[PDB]
Amino acid sequence: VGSVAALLTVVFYIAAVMATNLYGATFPEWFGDLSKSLYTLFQVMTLESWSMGIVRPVMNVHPNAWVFFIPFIMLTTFTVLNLFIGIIVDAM
Amino acid sequence: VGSVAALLTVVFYIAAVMATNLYGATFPEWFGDLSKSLYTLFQVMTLESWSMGIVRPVMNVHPNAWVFFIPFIMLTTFTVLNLFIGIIVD
Amino acid sequence: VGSVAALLTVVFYIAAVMATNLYGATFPEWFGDLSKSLYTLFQVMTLESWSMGIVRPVMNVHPNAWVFFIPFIMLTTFTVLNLFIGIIVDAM
Amino acid sequence: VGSVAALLTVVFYIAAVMATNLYGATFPEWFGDLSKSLYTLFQVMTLESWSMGIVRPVMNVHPNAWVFFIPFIMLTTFTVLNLFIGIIVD
Ligand code: NA
Ligand code: NA
Ligand code: NA
Ligand code: NA
Ligand code: NA
Ligand code: NA
Numbered sequence: 001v002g003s004v005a006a007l008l009t010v011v012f013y014i015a016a017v018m019a020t021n022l023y024g025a026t027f028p029e030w031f032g033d034l035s036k037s038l039y040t041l042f043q044v045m046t047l048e049s050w051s052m053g054i055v056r057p058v059m060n061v062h063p064n065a066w067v068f069f070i071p072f073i074m075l076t077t078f079t080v081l082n083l084f085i086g087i088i089v090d091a092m
Numbered sequence: 093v094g095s096v097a098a099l100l101t102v103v104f105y106i107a108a109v110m111a112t113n114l115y116g117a118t119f120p121e122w123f124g125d126l127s128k129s130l131y132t133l134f135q136v137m138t139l140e141s142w143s144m145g146i147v148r149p150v151m152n153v154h155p156n157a158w159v160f161f162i163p164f165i166m167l168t169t170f171t172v173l174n175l176f177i178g179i180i181v182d
Numbered sequence: 183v184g185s186v187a188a189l190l191t192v193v194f195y196i197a198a199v200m201a202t203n204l205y206g207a208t209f210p211e212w213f214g215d216l217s218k219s220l221y222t223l224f225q226v227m228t229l230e231s232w233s234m235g236i237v238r239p240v241m242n243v244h245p246n247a248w249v250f251f252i253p254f255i256m257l258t259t260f261t262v263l264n265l266f267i268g269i270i271v272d273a274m
Numbered sequence: 275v276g277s278v279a280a281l282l283t284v285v286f287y288i289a290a291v292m293a294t295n296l297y298g299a300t301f302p303e304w305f306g307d308l309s310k311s312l313y314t315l316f317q318v319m320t321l322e323s324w325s326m327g328i329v330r331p332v333m334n335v336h337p338n339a340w341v342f343f344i345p346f347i348m349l350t351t352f353t354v355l356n357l358f359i360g361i362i363v364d
């Protein structure tokens with residue numbers, strides 16, 4: 001369970017470093033610094049306005065922004081599910 | 093698990109072919125090409141603005157658009173859940 | 183699994199009959215007929231704009247509208263989860 | 275299962291007492307009283323407009339509002355999942 005939690009933190013930090021670089025100048029409210037980025041990627045991970053509120057306005061400037069977010073959503077959402085199920089199993 | 097992942101891809105492509113045809117002229121930002129369509133159906137599958145942001149404006153032009161989206165949402169969301177649980181078990 | 187699917191259909195129809203009556207005149211776009219209602223309660227069940235988009239504008243006219251929606255969300259979301267898990271169990 | 279349901283209620287009430295105090299004057303539509311607060315934290319827990327609709331406008335006045343909501347979301351969403359799975363097992 002600890003190895004799963006460690007993998008997500010490393011992925012979350014690398015993704016937020018990547019996102020800061022990619023979309024920080026064009027969209028500074030969302031990815032202007034590692035802080036703003038980690039908060040946006042948590043919001044994207046929970047799914048709240050991931051497309052209409054974040055990806056669609058982003059994709060309008062960066063046409064292939066979906067190559068980052070969709071695989072990010074596929075990985076993090078799977079891992080978070082796997083982590084939460086893992087805690088439940090390592091309790092009974 | 094591989095058979096589940098293959099079934100979802102085939103369904104996702106057929107649905108995105110269908111959606112392109114159905115709502116591409118009336119709503120080209122959302123379903124104007126197979127690309128735009130696959131991205132919209134992923135967004136609809138995750139549930140983000142599926143009704144207020146997508147289905148309601150669509151249904152306003154195509155009254156029975158819900159005959160496609162609701163069963164699509166029922167199938168894909170079930171399959172994705174089944175696939176993710178399948179990886180955890182295996 | 184069949185008994186679970188039957189329970190949800192009966193609940194969904196009764197709730198959509200109730201909602202049509204309660205909020206149909208004040209909010210006809212959302213609950214103006216059993217059809218419009220079943221579609222809104224499915225949207226509410228999936229969670230898409232349940233509060234900001236539906237319950238908050240409703241509660242503004244019907245202060246206690248939350249006595250219907252929150253318990254509806256607690257029951258249907260639990261049952262749908264229980265139904266989907268039930269299919270997975272009755273397969274392995 | 276009962277102990278899990280009791281833990282969530284205590285956390286939900288304490289969080290709604292905390293939120294009322296913290297953001298009630300600056301955002302009274304959302305956290306103006308324990309009632310308004312419990313309804314907002316249920317909405318935040320379900321995830322509906324948690325950031326764009328709630329946390330972002332809040333954070334604009336309280337820069338570190340995320341120190342309350344993100345850990346609240348991490349705890350309640352985990353507990354609700356654990357509770358619902360618990361009923362299914364029992
Ligand atoms: Na959701
Ligand atoms: Na959403
Ligand atoms: Na959502
Ligand atoms: Na939303
Ligand atoms: Na969600
Ligand atoms: Na939502």
